[PDB]
Amino acid sequence: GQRRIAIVAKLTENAEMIVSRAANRIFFEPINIARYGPERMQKSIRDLDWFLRYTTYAILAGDPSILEANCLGLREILEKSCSISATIVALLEMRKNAARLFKDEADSKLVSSYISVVIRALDADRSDAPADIVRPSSEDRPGLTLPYIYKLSADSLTTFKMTAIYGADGRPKVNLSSDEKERVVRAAYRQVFERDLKAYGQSVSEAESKVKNGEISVREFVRRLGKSELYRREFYQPFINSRVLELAFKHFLGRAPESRAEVQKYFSIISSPIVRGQSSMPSGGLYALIDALIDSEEYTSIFGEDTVPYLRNLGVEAQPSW
Amino acid sequence: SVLTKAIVNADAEARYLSPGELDRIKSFVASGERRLRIAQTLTEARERIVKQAGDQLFQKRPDVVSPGGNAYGEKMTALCLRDLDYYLRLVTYGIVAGDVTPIEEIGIIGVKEMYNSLQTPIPAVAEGVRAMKNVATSLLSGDDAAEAGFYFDYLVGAM
Amino acid sequence: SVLTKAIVNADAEARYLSPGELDRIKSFVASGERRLRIAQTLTEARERIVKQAGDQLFQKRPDVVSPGGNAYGEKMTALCLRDLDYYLRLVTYGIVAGDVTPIEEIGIIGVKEMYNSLQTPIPAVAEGVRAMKNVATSLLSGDDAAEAGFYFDYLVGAM
Amino acid sequence: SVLTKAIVNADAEARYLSPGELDRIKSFVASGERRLRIAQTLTEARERIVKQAGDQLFQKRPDVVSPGGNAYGEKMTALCLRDLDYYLRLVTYGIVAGDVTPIEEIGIIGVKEMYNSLQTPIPAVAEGVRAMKNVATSLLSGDDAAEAGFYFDYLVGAM
Amino acid sequence: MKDAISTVIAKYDSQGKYFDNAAVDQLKAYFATGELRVRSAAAISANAQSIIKEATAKALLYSSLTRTGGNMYYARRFAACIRDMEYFLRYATFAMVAGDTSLLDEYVLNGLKETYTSLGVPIDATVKGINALREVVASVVGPEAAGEASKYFDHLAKGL
Amino acid sequence: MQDAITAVINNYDVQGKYLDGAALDKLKAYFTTGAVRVRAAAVISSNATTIIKEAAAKALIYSDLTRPGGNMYTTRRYAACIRDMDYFLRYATYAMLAGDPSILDERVLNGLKETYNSLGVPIAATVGGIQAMKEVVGGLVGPDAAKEASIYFDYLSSGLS
Amino acid sequence: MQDAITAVINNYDVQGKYLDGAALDKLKAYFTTGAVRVRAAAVISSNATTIIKEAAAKALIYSDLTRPGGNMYTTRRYAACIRDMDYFLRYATYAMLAGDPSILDERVLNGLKETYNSLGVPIAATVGGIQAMKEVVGGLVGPDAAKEASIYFDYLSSGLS
Amino acid sequence: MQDAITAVINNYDVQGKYLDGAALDKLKAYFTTGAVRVRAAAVISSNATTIIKEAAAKALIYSDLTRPGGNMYTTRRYAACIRDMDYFLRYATYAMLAGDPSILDERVLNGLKETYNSLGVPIAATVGGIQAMKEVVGGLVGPDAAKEASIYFDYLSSGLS
Amino acid sequence: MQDAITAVINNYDVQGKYLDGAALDKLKAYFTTGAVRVRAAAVISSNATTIIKEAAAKALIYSDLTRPGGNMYTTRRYAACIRDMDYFLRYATYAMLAGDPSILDERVLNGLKETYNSLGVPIAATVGGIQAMKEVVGGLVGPDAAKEASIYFDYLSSGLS
Ligand SMILES: *[C@H](C)[C@H]1/C(=C/c2[nH]c(/C=C3N=C(/C=C4\NC(=O)C(CC)=C4C)C(C)=C\3CCC(=O)O)c(CCC(=O)O)c2C)NC(=O)[C@@H]1C
Ligand SMILES: *[C@H](C)[C@H]1/C(=C/c2[nH]c(/C=C3N=C(/C=C4\NC(=O)C(CC)=C4C)C(C)=C\3CCC(=O)O)c(CCC(=O)O)c2C)NC(=O)[C@@H]1C
Ligand SMILES: *[C@H](C)[C@H]1/C(=C/c2[nH]c(/C=C3N=C(/C=C4\NC(=O)C(CC)=C4C)C(C)=C\3CCC(=O)O)c(CCC(=O)O)c2C)NC(=O)[C@@H]1C
Ligand SMILES: *[C@H](C)[C@H]1/C(=C/c2[nH]c(/C=C3N=C(/C=C4\NC(=O)C(CC)=C4C)C(C)=C\3CCC(=O)O)c(CCC(=O)O)c2C)NC(=O)[C@@H]1C
Ligand SMILES: *[C@H](C)[C@H]1/C(=C/c2[nH]c(/C=C3N=C(/C=C4\NC(=O)C(CC)=C4C)C(C)=C\3CCC(=O)O)c(CCC(=O)O)c2C)NC(=O)[C@@H]1C
Ligand SMILES: *[C@H](C)[C@H]1/C(=C/c2[nH]c(/C=C3N=C(/C=C4\NC(=O)C(CC)=C4C)C(C)=C\3CCC(=O)O)c(CCC(=O)O)c2C)NC(=O)[C@@H]1C
Ligand SMILES: *[C@H](C)[C@H]1/C(=C/c2[nH]c(/C=C3N=C(/C=C4\NC(=O)C(CC)=C4C)C(C)=C\3CCC(=O)O)c(CCC(=O)O)c2C)NC(=O)[C@@H]1C
Ligand SMILES: CCC1=C(C)/C(=C/C2=NC(=C\c3[nH]c(/C=C4\NC(=O)[C@H](C)[C@H]4CC)c(C)c3CCC(=O)O)/C(CCC(=O)O)=C2C)NC1=O
């Protein structure tokens, strides 16, 4: 960072010149200053400085992402407004400027790499750049779509998953480092119970054993947690039934309950006296609630069988206003 | 209603309404005027439909209006007829809506539970609805009757 | 308690208590008076049980009461005996409850973590509880002792 | 508006609107179209009214646009003119409403406190409003001017 | 949700009334309008992308927001605002069909001011953007259906 | 509360826009309707006592409610019920003049359900009474006025239910 | 939740006191009552559907609530109301076996008032239904059991109100 | 309210313990800080109007809030916001003298979030204003005083958010 | 969360200004401190269990809290308290690396007061424990690191109190 600061300082003082040469070059196809008009020219001047100011920031930051997010959509925005080529030609000048300012090859190179990111998006088509997913809903909760650059700006989400591996034996065996296996389990425990249950030093013995071996899935593990004695009494038993279904939303699906009709459907599940079940595993009741959530397509699709549920949040999946 | 259903599917998909979906809406709005007339006819004949259906039901099921039976006594018999009237009103609502959803929310969800607490026999109620259908069909023209029949059938199926 | 456990299972299932569950409750209420006497006996002998068990433990484990050991010194030895007393009180509570749950909440959850911070050896604590069991068994009649033993064994298992 | 004011007085008295009150409402609705024209006139002349009034104010009060004064500097002078524009917009709203209440809620409550924090002199603001009135009066026809004057006077009174 | 047909139904069931002519009149009215509302909706869907872009230009673009230290500033921020303008359009169209305002507030208006205040988004600007969408939409739609289409836009504006 | 004129003003004020012709047209629309509304209001005020009487006769009185064990049994309760009826009528009249339903929400509708539930007043019967008043009012005001009057009565009814 | 036996234990545990004769006497008292309670619970479970039916007949059905515009109007709402009644009955039975009111507080009572107020369910009517259930239950269980049963029903009623 | 000296006393009183050297040391620590705090408080009181002005200039004014459709638009709303700012400043000064955050909890912090949510006042903007006040205050009080002043400002901010 | 470097960047970005040398110097200052911070963090991680043990010994244990009727009485509560202590330590270490107090506000400080009040956990005792941890940490990290470590510990303490 310290030398990166020095690199930034050098770039800062020569920045106005660096911009000028890129601008003089373009002001491929060459476009005259006058036909563009002052405002469009003024914008173009601003834009050059804009790329450069982010570059300085990106140096200090030491991440491609800051430049990455802004450049993506920008290329789409530009086109009717601007020639794609002129923007490119500009960096040709500024990378040459960059090489001149910093005599250390590496110092010029890193500065080049930031400028490379900006260019690489511009080079990539509007189509080549990918639109971010849109969270889907059934008959309630309208479907919301999130922009990708928004998703990129947001800090990456750590996903804990353990995948069952087929064997020659035909009994699944799962390969992970000693720390790595059990880390998924550590986070699962933590998501469902909302705190890590090791500091209390109880956890279902047989649950986790089966997932370590890999025969019952992580999806089936989180199922086993909800049904577990630990999960009630910690949750369920201290709350009224209407509050339990709201917490059970948060930890099992990562969203809050989104509509009146769903909190009603779920309230009837937990309320309903069980149909008598042959499985000694107690029939429905609150267990029904937990089933209905894991068995839900929304659950299975977003998380899949391997992933442990994660909390969807501002960064991911948009998040609704109502 | 038809329109609500279409909008809801679009919103789930997070898309503007498809041409095909739009076409169905167009068809529905054209049908509506005919539907309104069918509904109007049944409303005017409502009093007689209920009366005729009631008599048929009581002939079909002597037991319900018998000392053991739930319907027995003037108060109880009135309530049974009131129920028939309710279902007829729901059917009219359905015809204008073009969907069973209006009917379904008001009358078909929790119906089993309500009647079981009351101890009213569900099959008898179904027979009454069938009876009402027959009376209604006679007053309606054939094509009109077919439209009305669908809604009547749904009710019978639901109970 | 037995009854609490039964109620909780029913509530999870969202059903009224099963006949079998009810029968177990009946058995428990009959047993209770006998259980109360067993608990009373141990309470009266509590002071001596703790003292005798302590001595046995220290003989079994010289190290714990040694300059290196955690128990060493008057203050520390008192605390070790206080712990034994605590566990005995918990056992009495368990016998009257007919379940380990009362014992479990107060004493067995997070016990490992607490002792590890203290640096007290968990196995030595278990030995102390075993020692207490032997003293308690002698004072109790055989059938009473068996009942008491179960609770004592649970504690030993937990640590 | 006039109607809101009348309703509010009636509600306080817990009575239906008096015939006299109703008559005033009738008169107001007739007057409204004329009022709309008066408001339209001022809106069109708004830019010039503000400019002329500003100049008059600055001549009347050299101090406000002086290094000590609040108005001094381009940024500050713009803000002073913006304020004059705001008050003119409020006056137009008042004329159409037929009451000062719309004006009053947006501009006259807490005005003292706001300006005191800003340190703007309240009397100078009042002079600016007076200046705007004179310009506005000239463009308006005499009877129209009298109507407009009342609203302008209220503002001056309020500050 | 609730649309003009089901709204009339819902008011009648709470009273326990069978459908009256007064009610039948309101229902007829919807069916007359409906045919062109379907036409107007299709127009808005086709030109949506264009409609948004024009609207942004009129108000959102070339504002303080675009300048640094405003919400529009950045590509990321710019993209988000456009999504919000697309949201407002789909709903208003959904509201145009159906003919009941409520679809709007269940899906849009409820909670919006609270999110916007939390995010820091300026409410006034969005209101301006909605009003802009209204003018563009009206031209594409044509005069007869414009009155209809303007209502749903105005509801959104006063909600915010 | 809010009225149509103020509603237009408020919408413009949040925009910061000066009043424009389109806005003026909305105001003009209200002004034409206004004369009719004033006439309707005067009719209602003069016939208010009778309107309440007729509506009560149609729904409330000669019923179990008035009989012992009914909510409107005892003089005190009877008087309260007719006072409530008068409130609904007066507020609806205010709303009709205003051309806005907001006053009903701000004064009448807010917390009414909860108040009634604590009191044990029957909501459905009250709604019935409101509907009855509407019918009587419709006659007196005449058809053009009736449409305007009906919406406010219906608004009250929907709120309570 | 908590039960009588555990309640005694917990009180002693906070004191740190070993169980004493006075404490034992309270436990002994519970044990004698226990047999009666078990019999009562079985009676209630078998007659639960009828108890609800009778109570509804006494208070809820044949009322404004069931009439259009009433809270229990429509099949869906009717079914909801009887479901709530069943909840109250089941929990009261649990409490009676336990000999402690705590479970009612932890599951039924906490947040119910607020939920009902938002929903617009009438609390006083619900309380009326609970009281009706109590009366029916009292008959079936018989006198000794009735006193015990009544306290839990009353506890629910007081909480809601 | 409570202060530092009383807080120590209260902790000892619940224990029933006589004051001990460890307790005395905490009291002694406060006494040294005291003189600085008194000077800071006098500075803030004299410059209070300006502090508010500067903080508003930094965050609140020249913003969307002040522009039409913003929360602080209209004189009434503007005046309200500056009144709130004054409250925060006065209480923070009290807290700084006291050496305890409790007064903020008892007076300012309790129910503020709920009030703001009902009003529709934006919490984040308010927090921004508080932070701005802190910065201005920091300058005037000087560095030693600033550290002490900052904690109370931060406490207010954390409570609101 | 936010870090020192990003905080400076964000302030400059809203201004639109390229980074000033004075700003750069602050960033440079952070970069030098970062090496020392990393060493401190490694020390804390290795000695974390002991740090907690020592701090508990200083404040929490041999106290009324651990005695029956005290908040930390029972194994479950004891374990909870030491878990909380570990949280504070881990987050303070994170804050020290970050060079910014914000993470503490975002994760630890937000909702803590409310949680503690519902639980009935005593804030002053918790604060005491945090201060004790700070003292132990100060020793292990050594003087240069201690100053940096102390500020985050103090920040936590001020937030809780
Ligand atoms: C045209 C050949 C030249 C030019 C001028 C220009 N720019 C715009 C519009 C925008 N430019 C930006 C700027 C940025 N936002 C970012 O995140 C980044 C990356 C760091 C930049 C550079 C944006 C967001 C816009 C759109 C809106 C706005 O004005 O802020 C236009 C007009 C197009 C429009 O209005 O949408 C024009 C004419 N830019 C160049 O570099 C070219 C050489
Ligand atoms: C007639 C075909 C059958 C019959 C009817 C019957 N019903 C009742 C009582 C009630 N029925 C209803 C039903 C409805 N309420 C609703 O909200 C709807 C949907 C709109 C329906 C259909 C209700 C609420 C009642 C309860 C009483 C009340 O009005 O408050 C009875 C008498 C009840 C009793 O057992 O005492 C009867 C007899 N019974 C038959 O046997 C016929 C086949
Ligand atoms: C007889 C001396 C006079 C007379 C009486 C009269 N009353 C009615 C109608 C009603 N009177 C009551 C009164 C009561 N209800 C109560 O709750 C109490 C207190 C316990 C009283 C005294 C009610 C409620 C009614 C309304 C109708 C109903 O029964 O629900 C009438 C006829 C109704 C009408 O006026 O059209 C009459 C005639 N009339 C006289 O002139 C005698 C002097
Ligand atoms: C019946 C005696 C009365 C009555 C009941 C009623 N309740 C609802 C709806 C709900 N009831 C609850 C309440 C609970 N949540 C809990 O956790 C518990 C304890 C375990 C209870 C009792 C809830 C959550 C709902 C909402 C669920 C849903 O909407 O389906 C209704 C329906 C109201 C509605 O608008 O849907 C009714 C009718 N109301 C009466 O009229 C009786 C006096
Ligand atoms: C001009 C006649 C006098 C004058 C004006 C002046 N005003 C400001 C700053 C502001 N004035 C306002 C006032 C309003 N906001 C509203 O909402 C309304 C009613 C709709 C009014 C009247 C506001 C809010 C400001 C603050 C700036 C902002 O809005 O962002 C200044 C500048 C003050 C400063 O130093 O910052 C000035 C100069 N000054 C005089 O002395 C003239 C007599
Ligand atoms: C004796 C078998 C062994 C032993 C005992 C020992 N314990 C401590 C200190 C503590 N013991 C506890 C334990 C409990 N608190 C509870 O609430 C319960 C459940 C009811 C228990 C069992 C606690 C909290 C402490 C901390 C001190 C305090 O009471 O405040 C010590 C002291 C050592 C230390 O403090 O680090 C000792 C010696 N250790 C042995 O070596 C024996 C094998
Ligand atoms: C120890 C220094 C003091 C103490 C602690 C104590 N805490 C709890 C329970 C909880 N503490 C928390 C707090 C956090 N969760 C978080 O995520 C964070 C930030 C990362 C914190 C600090 C929570 C949520 C709980 C409840 C969850 C749980 O199961 O523990 C207890 C137990 C209280 C109880 O009776 O349940 C205790 C004892 N109390 C003291 O006596 C010390 C002064
Ligand atoms: C279906 C109804 C609905 C709405 C309306 C909605 C609004 C909405 N706007 C959001 C963000 C946002 N919204 C805007 C919008 C704007 N900034 C401006 O200055 C403009 C005036 C304005 C649009 C033109 C911005 C900039 C963000 C990103 C937040 C930020 O980082 O500043 C987000 C956060 C979601 C995300 O970005 O992940 C939501 C929830 N969501 C919904 O579900």
Rounded to whole angstroms, the Cα distance separating I131 from I152 reads 11
Rounded to whole angstroms, the Cα distance separating F92 from F102 reads 11
Mutate to test the interface with G, among E11, E12, E14, E17 (most CBs of G within 10 A): E14
Q: Which ligand 5 atom is the nearest neighbour of the CA of H62?
A: 30
Give the DSSP letter string of H114-149: HHHHHHT--HHHHHHHHHHHHHHHHHHH-HHHHHHH
The answer to whether F13 and E160 are in contact (CB under 8 A) is no
D83 lines ligand 5 (CB under 6 A): yes
Chain E residue with CA closest to G67: the answer is: E16
Ramachandran sector of residue H156 (left: φ over 0; alpha: ψ -120 to 50; beta: rest): alpha
Put simply, the answer to whether C7 touches G107 (Cβ < 8 Å) is no
Lookup result for tokens 């007061």:
I113
Q: Is H19 within 8 Å of chain D by CB? A: no
Chain E residues 92-131 with a CB less than 8 Å from chain A: 106-108, 110-112, 114-115
Q: How far is F4 from chain G (nearest CA, A)?
A: 30
Dihedrals phi, psi of A161, to nearest 5 degrees: -140, 145
Rounded to whole angstroms, the Cα distance separating B103 from B111 reads 12
| Among the listed residues A316, A320, A322, the one whose alpha carbon sits nearest the alpha carbon of residue A132 | A316
Do the chains G and F touch each other, judged by at least 3 C-beta pairs below 8 angstroms?
yes
The answer to whether C131 and C53 are in contact (CB under 8 A) is yes
Q: Which letter, b or e, does each residue of G127-146 get, where b requires 16 or more Cβ atoms within 10 Å of its Cβ?
A: bbbbbbbbebbbebbeeebb
Rounded to whole angstroms, the Cα distance separating B134 from E4 reads 31
* CA separation, residue A121 to residues A26, A112, H66 (Å): 19, 15, 39
Residue D116: HSE in the Cβ half-sphere, 13 Å Cα cutoff: 9
Dihedrals phi, psi of A145, to nearest 5 degrees: -115, 140
Residue D15 in marked binding region: no
Please tell me whether residue C154 adopts helix, strand or coil conformation.
Answer: helix
Rounded to whole angstroms, the Cα distance separating C89 from A164 reads 48
Structure-determination technique: cryo-EM
Q: CB neighbours (10 Å) of residue H50? A: 13
Per the DSSP assignment, residues forming a β-bridge with A135 are A144
The answer to whether C38 and C129 are in contact (CB under 8 A) is no
| Among the listed residues H93, H161, H98, H95, the one whose alpha carbon sits nearest the alpha carbon of residue H128 | H161
Task: Out of I53, I58, I60, I61, give the residue to mutate to test ligand 6, the one with the largest number of ligand atoms within 8 Å of its CB.
Answer: I61
Lookup result for tokens 């920008």:
A74
Residue F149, H or E segment = helix F143-160
* Distance between first and last Cα of chain D: 21
Hey, what are C1's tokens? 């308690």
The answer to whether D23 and D34 are in contact (CB under 8 A) is no
Put simply, the answer to whether G124 touches F118 (Cβ < 8 Å) is yes
Put simply, the answer to whether G52 touches B105 (Cβ < 8 Å) is no
The answer to whether G68 and G119 are in contact (CB under 8 A) is no
| Among the listed residues I74, I77, I89, the one whose alpha carbon sits nearest the alpha carbon of residue I41 | I89
Hey, what are D124's tokens? 């100078």
- Ligand nearest to the CA of residue D89, numbered in listed order: 5
Put simply, the answer to whether G70 touches F124 (Cβ < 8 Å) is yes
Hey, what are A208's tokens? 């986790």
Cβ-based burial of F3 (10 A; exposed 0-12, middle 13-18, buried ≥19): buried
Residue G77 in marked binding region: yes
Cβ-based burial of A155 (10 A; exposed 0-12, middle 13-18, buried ≥19): exposed
- State the chains in contact with A (3 or more Cβ–Cβ pairs under 8 Å): B, C, E, G, I
Residue A29, H or E segment = none
The answer to whether H46 and H128 are in contact (CB under 8 A) is no
Residue D1: HSE in the Cβ half-sphere, 13 Å Cα cutoff: 27
Rounded to whole angstroms, the Cα distance separating A102 from A94 reads 12
Task: Out of A36, A82, A114, A117, give the residue to mutate to test ligand 1, the one with the largest number of ligand atoms within 8 Å of its CB.
Answer: A82
Distance G62 CA to ligand 3 centre (A): 26
Q: What is the 3-state secondary structure (H, E, C) of chain E?
A: CCCHHHHHHHHHHHHCCCCCHHHHHHHHHHHHHHHHHHHHHHHHHHCHHHHHHHHHHHCCCCCCCCCCCCCCCCHHHHHHHHHHHHHHHHHHHHHHCCCCCHHHHHHHHCCHHHHHHHHCCCHHHHHHHHHHHHHHHHHHHCHHHHHHHHHHHHHHHHHC
Do the chains E and G touch each other, judged by at least 3 C-beta pairs below 8 angstroms?
yes
Q: Cα C17 from chain centroid?
A: 29
Residue F74 in marked binding region: yes
Rounded to whole angstroms, the Cα distance separating F8 from F17 reads 11
Put simply, the answer to whether I21 touches A53 (Cβ < 8 Å) is no
Which residue, judged by its Cα, is nearest atom 13 of ligand 5? D83
Per the DSSP assignment, residues forming a β-bridge with F139 are none
Put simply, the answer to whether C110 touches I52 (Cβ < 8 Å) is no
Give the DSSP letter string of A128-190: TSPPPPEE--SSSS--EE--HHHHHHSPPPP--B------SSSS------TTTTTHHHHHHHH
Q: Is B110 within 8 Å of chain G by CB? A: yes
| Among the listed residues F124, B86, B102, E12, the one whose alpha carbon sits nearest the alpha carbon of residue G69 | F124
- Ligand nearest to the CA of residue F65, numbered in listed order: 3
Chain A residues 29-88 with a CB less than 8 Å from chain C: none
Q: CB neighbours (10 Å) of residue E87? A: 18
Q: Looking at residue D104, what DSSP letter applies?
A: I
Q: Which ligand 1 atom is the nearest neighbour of the CA of A26?
A: 43
| Among the listed residues F29, F3, F2, F24, the one whose alpha carbon sits nearest the alpha carbon of residue F12 | F24
- Helix-helix angle F4-15:D74-97, to 10 degrees: 170
Single-letter amino acid, residue G130: I
Put simply, the answer to whether I159 touches H161 (Cβ < 8 Å) is no
Put simply, the answer to whether E118 touches H70 (Cβ < 8 Å) is no
- Ligand nearest to the CA of residue F76, numbered in listed order: 3
Rounded to whole angstroms, the Cα distance separating F4 from D153 reads 26
Chain A residue with CA closest to I33: the answer is: A2
The answer to whether H52 and H133 are in contact (CB under 8 A) is yes
Ligand 6 is surrounded, with C-beta below 6 A, by: C 64, 69-71, 76, 79-80, 83-84, 86, 106-107, 118, 120-121, 124-125, 128; I 61-62, 66, 73-75, 78
Rounded to whole angstroms, the Cα distance separating H9 from G156 reads 43
Q: Which ligand 8 atom is the nearest neighbour of the CA of E128?
A: 21
Q: What is the structure's resolution, reported in angstroms to one decimal?
A: 2.8
Rounded to whole angstroms, the Cα distance separating C28 from G99 reads 14
- Ligand nearest to the CA of residue D87, numbered in listed order: 5
Chain E residue with CA closest to H73: the answer is: E124
Rounded to whole angstroms, the Cα distance separating B129 from B54 reads 9
The answer to whether G121 and G159 are in contact (CB under 8 A) is no
CB pairs under 8 A between E and F: 19
* Distance between first and last Cα of chain H: 22
Dihedrals phi, psi of B28, to nearest 5 degrees: -60, -45
Chain H residue with CA closest to E116: the answer is: H122
Please tell me whether residue A307 adopts helix, strand or coil conformation.
Answer: strand
Single-letter amino acid, residue A292: A
Chain A residue with CA closest to G109: the answer is: A240
State which residues form the domain around I122.
Answer: 1-161
When divided into structural domains, chain I yields a total of 1
Cβ-based burial of I93 (10 A; exposed 0-12, middle 13-18, buried ≥19): buried
Which residues in chain F are contacts of D33 at CB distance < 8 A?
28, 31
A310 lines ligand 4 (CB under 6 A): no
Task: Out of I89, I121, I126, I161, give the residue to mutate to test ligand 7, the one with the largest number of ligand atoms within 8 Å of its CB.
Answer: I121
Q: Is H23 within 8 Å of chain D by CB? A: no
Q: Is C102 within 8 Å of chain I by CB? A: no
| Among the listed residues G122, G142, G129, the one whose alpha carbon sits nearest the alpha carbon of residue G89 | G129
| Among the listed residues F73, F71, B107, B79, the one whose alpha carbon sits nearest the alpha carbon of residue G57 | B79
Put simply, the answer to whether H82 touches D113 (Cβ < 8 Å) is yes
Sign of the torsion angle spanned by Cα atoms A268, A273, A275, A277:
positive
Task: Out of E58, E84, E88, E110, give the residue to mutate to test ligand 8, the one with the largest number of ligand atoms within 8 Å of its CB.
Answer: E84
CATH of the domain at I86: 1.10.490.20
Q: How far is I53 from chain C (nearest CA, A)?
A: 6
| Among the listed residues A61, B97, C1, the one whose alpha carbon sits nearest the alpha carbon of residue I12 | A61
Which residues in chain G are contacts of I69 at CB distance < 8 A?
14-16
F21-26 CB contacts, 8 Å cutoff, 24+ apart: F21/D40, F24/D36, F24/D40
| Among the listed residues A233, A238, C6, the one whose alpha carbon sits nearest the alpha carbon of residue G37 | C6
